Design a protein around this nucleic acid. Structure first.
Lengths: 63, 49, 79
RNA sequence: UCUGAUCGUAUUGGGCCUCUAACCUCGGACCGUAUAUCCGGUUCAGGGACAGUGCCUGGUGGGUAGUUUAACUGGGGCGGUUGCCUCCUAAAAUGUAACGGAGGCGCCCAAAGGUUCCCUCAACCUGGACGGCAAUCAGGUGUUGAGUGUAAGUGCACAAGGGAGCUUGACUGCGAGACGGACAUGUCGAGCAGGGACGAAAGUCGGGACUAGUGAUCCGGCACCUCUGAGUGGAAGGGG
RNA sequence: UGCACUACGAGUAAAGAUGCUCGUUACGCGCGGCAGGACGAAAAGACCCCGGGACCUUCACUACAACUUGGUAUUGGUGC
RNA sequence: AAAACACAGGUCCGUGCGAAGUCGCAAGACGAUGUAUACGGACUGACGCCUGCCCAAGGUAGCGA
RNA sequence: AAGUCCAAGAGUGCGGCAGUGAGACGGCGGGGGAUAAGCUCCGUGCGUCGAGAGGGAAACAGCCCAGAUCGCCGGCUAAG
RNA sequence: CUGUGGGUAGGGGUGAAAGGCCAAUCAAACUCCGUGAUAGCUGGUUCUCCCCGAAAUGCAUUUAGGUGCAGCGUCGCAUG
RNA sequence: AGCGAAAGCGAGUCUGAAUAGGGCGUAUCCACACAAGAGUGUGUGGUGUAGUGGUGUGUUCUGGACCCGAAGCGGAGUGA
RNA sequence: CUGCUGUGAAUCUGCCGGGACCACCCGGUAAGCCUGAAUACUUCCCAGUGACCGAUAGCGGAUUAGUACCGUGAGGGAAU
RNA sequence: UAUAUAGGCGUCUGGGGGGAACGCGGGGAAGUGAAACAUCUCAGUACCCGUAGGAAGAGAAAACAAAAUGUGAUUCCGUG
């Protein structure tokens, strides 16, 4: 058999050119009014996943 | 809503640039304020909706 | 026999984050406070919520002036 | 065809009355047939383009089926809570439970925001028409006891409190470095550029003295973009 | 039916001790009886709670059977 | 093993007759070789007793035992 | 600044593998209770049991001394 | 009342109605199959020595006797 | 060979008006400069970066997946 | 690409497909047939094999074996 | 009843049932997973019906492809 790869994570996390796992920040989709532009800029981008859930995410991505 | 989210758009490029809450009782009319329009790269008078 | 009370709020971790004679980088928070328990002196600035932060690399110092405790950043000399 | 009533002829739907050839009758009589209340066939008698059946469609429907019907909890139920903010508990860093003690929040303000400038209350004493204990006015005493939109606390008389002029920074593109932190969240931020406000300049302005006023992802809506476009040009859809 | 040459009082102990502590009492082995203990045997408590199930009720949700309403095919002619 | 079910009696409802109803996807079957004095459903459950002035419009009209 | 530094078998970071997430009691500071509970909920670079024998406390996980590598028919000693 | 012979079969039958009976069972019979159903639950999990050595906490949870992450163990690697 | 949603570019690319700051990547190291000591950076040079295919071991994935254990669900047949 | 219900075309300047659709190009020429080989499986038979079992194992069945026996029946089903 | 047909009579040729798997066509579950559950998965599996063959089915472009001077029925393997 073949090891299936989790879709919900294969389409939510990425892999950089060295191995880091990055993710997009939440709380930025709707209700964007009353969120000061400072907060919105903070929430924009792609941050590396915390080492705590790094292993879980790695298992989910690799299968 | 008494204080609904209204969107303000520049008059020159007609880009909906800003959004904020305004009162419909204290000011029952479309306000006009000057804000910064990134497209025009300059300040342009902005009006509701 | 219900109880009307029972509510509380979260842990706003206030308090001094850098104490006397501590070497700091620019921008670091020195105290997270509510109100003006401390004031700024030299090289110390006030943030949005009455936070105090450094404005230059240095060493923290706590003093007083005109009757109000103030926080200052004495510039350490390069050895 | 442009601004345009009525036209002549041909194509059609509905309502109503009928007819018979579709179709129907467990109404009759004959034949297969020697037996047959089956069935089929012939014919007569009644209905009749209805009814019934096919596809489509809106209602009624525990008649039947698959399921759901939270947790805390000094056993369980009943009652009462469930998120966020402030105080005490909380043992002078942070933090810390209980169905422990008190309360607030699900906003409001186009000015109650930005900036420049100026001012100092509450209370008390003495005098004054209505007007008094308390309104407005005069003098004095008055360093915080008034007020600070909204809970409590931390602060505010250097005023963050009270007035006025002008303004929209309740910006755009960012952000060294930090706090808090299981993670996701959450807060602070000097400073750089563009274009503005106020001010003579220096300077302050990325919402309100601070801390509550909020809800992940998914899915989809609405505007713009040097994106993409299933042979090709487009468009549909997708993407930012 | 874990064992065994299986006492009693007062205690201690997962808080009701044949089995531990300190004292008391008791020669070894049987037979016939009583039923106070061995938390006796019996039945992985039927009570109560938790999880799963079943069946039942209904103006819980969602479906379907069935019923009923219309379009159309079967389906036609003549008159207004 | 009864106070429960049943029961003869009563009152409603459906049914005009390959009825209504039920079994069956249908054909068909029972109802019935019956026909509203019958069939099916539903409650109740022999038998007797239960009360007057208003009550093309008379009025509070609920008996008031 | 020194200090143990042939070690605390330390700290930090990252990886493989976990278990745990039902705690009890004792001393202090406290809430609930009646300032009762062998009660309940908290803090304690506080302890022990948990997962720990040995000696003392008559017996007696949590109290006092003391942390069991094995042998010895030796001494010294802790609490008592 | 009873003999003999037949009929009604499971979400079905039969019931002068008890949820009664339908082959010693019935709030949906029996057997075989799907099937090694599933069970956050209980039990079980077999030889030895050496070294190290926990937790019963925080947060979140259709969650509280489960689980994820962190804390606390071990092993390898890096700094020291 | 990476960056970016993508077109696209590429030891760089995305963002953005901007080598103005950042984001990710340019393995690594050591020497020289030029800078401020905002944590250090910017350019020169030198060494040249190491994956992959067998197999052992530990966890894990899809199958029942360490073993036993329900009540009950469904299909087809057996029974008056 | 297909099944049911309505409606309903042209014969090459025709008709379909190229992932809604439109034009140009490109490929085919529906509503008519048949066609081996490469491929799946062992009731049965023949010749062998085994880092397979060896009488509680290996088939339920090394011996009466689907036997005795259990059940009304489907069906379950041994020991030597 | 008239043509005629249904039907009747005779005679000839075939089918009927069984078989372990595999083939083709058609109906088609639920337990379970989702930590509940309805879409969904289980799974077009189980089971059933029809129907054969030594194999079956599909098969000779109203095909793919993308401007490549393209490949040229079907089938089944391995990648993708």
């Amino acid at each position: 058999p073949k090891a299936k790869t989790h879709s919900g994570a294969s389409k939510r996390f990425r892999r950089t050119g060295t191995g880091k796992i990055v993710r997009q920040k939440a709380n930025r989709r709707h209700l964007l009014e009353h969120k000061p532009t400072k907060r919105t800029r903070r929430l924009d981008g792609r941050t590396t996943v915390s080492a705590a859930d790094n292993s879980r995410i790695n298992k989910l991505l690799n299968g | 809503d008494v204080r609904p989210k209204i969107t303000l758009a520049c008059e020159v490029c007609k880009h909906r640039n800003y959004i904020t809450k305004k009162n419909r009782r204290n000011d029952p009319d479309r306000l006009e304020i000057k804000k910064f329009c990134p497209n025009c790269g300059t300040h342009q008078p902005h009006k509701e909706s | 026999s219900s109880s009307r009370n029972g509510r509380d709020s979260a842990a706003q971790r206030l308090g001094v984050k850098r104490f006397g004679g501590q070497v700091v980088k620019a921008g670091e928070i020195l105290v997270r406070q509510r109100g003006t328990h401390f004031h700024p002196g030299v090289n110390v600035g006030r943030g949005g919520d009455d936070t105090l932060f450094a404005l230059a690399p240095g060493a923290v110092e706590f003093g007083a002036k005109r009757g109000r405790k103030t926080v200052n950043i004495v510039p350490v000399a390069r050895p």
